């Protein structure tokens, strides 16, 4: 339960940083 919440939140964070990598990658290659 509490052992499963932190693993869940760990995934959310891992997925949130993957989104950021993609979003930031886009912001670079379409500029000016």
């Amino acid at each position: 339960s509490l052992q499963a919440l932190e693993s869940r939140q760990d995934d959310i964070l891992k997925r949130l940083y993957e989104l950021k990598a993609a979003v930031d990658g886009l912001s670079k290659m379409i500029q000016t």
């Binding site: 509490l2 932190e6 939140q9 959310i12 964070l13 949130l16 989104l19 950021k20 979003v23 912001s27």
Partner: protein, 71 residues
């Protein structure tokens, strides 16, 4: 409670930051796409309206010729 509840806030708050950051970056990228679209929608309207005007003058110019020859 425990110090685990501590860093379950440090992780739940860290996610709230990235969500905010991501909404702001996707909204900017949406505006780029809206800008690029509206800019293209200008030139099509500029070009088309120039053709419509060129035909109005040529319709007007022959409305004078038809008025003279019939008068």
């Amino acid at each position: 409670n425990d110090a685990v509840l501590k860093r379950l806030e440090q992780k739940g708050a860290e996610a709230d930051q990235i969500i905010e950051y991501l909404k702001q970056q996707v909204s900017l990228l949406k505006e780029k796409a809206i800008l690029q679209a509206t800019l293209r929608e200008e030139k099509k309207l500029r070009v088309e309206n120039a053709k419509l005007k060129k035909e109005i003058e040529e319709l007007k110019q022959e409305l004078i010729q038809a008025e003279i020859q019939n008068g």
